Amino acid sequence: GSSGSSGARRPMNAFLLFCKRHRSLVRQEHPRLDNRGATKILADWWAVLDPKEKQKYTDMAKEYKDAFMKANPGYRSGPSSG
């Protein structure tokens, strides 16, 4: 959370995935926009996303993250998905 340190760097997320996918889309429909602006458009785009899509995305993140997950002592993972 927010204790007092900026994590090294996270992988991605179901949302961060759609942004990395629609990134160009937005950037295109709005090149002038800024990393903040284009990111403000993606948000909504996501905010207006179905589950099926989120699912696949979530998997990608749940898959991309795990991969990254290596040197993490304080982590969570219950016996259900393996």
UniProtKB/Swiss-Prot annotation:
Name this polypeptide is given: HMG box transcription factor BBX
Subcellular location: Nucleus
Gene: Bbx
Function: Transcription factor that is necessary for cell cycle progression from G1 to S phase.
DNA-binding region(s) from the entry: 8-76
Full-sequence portion shown in this chain: 80 to 148 of 907
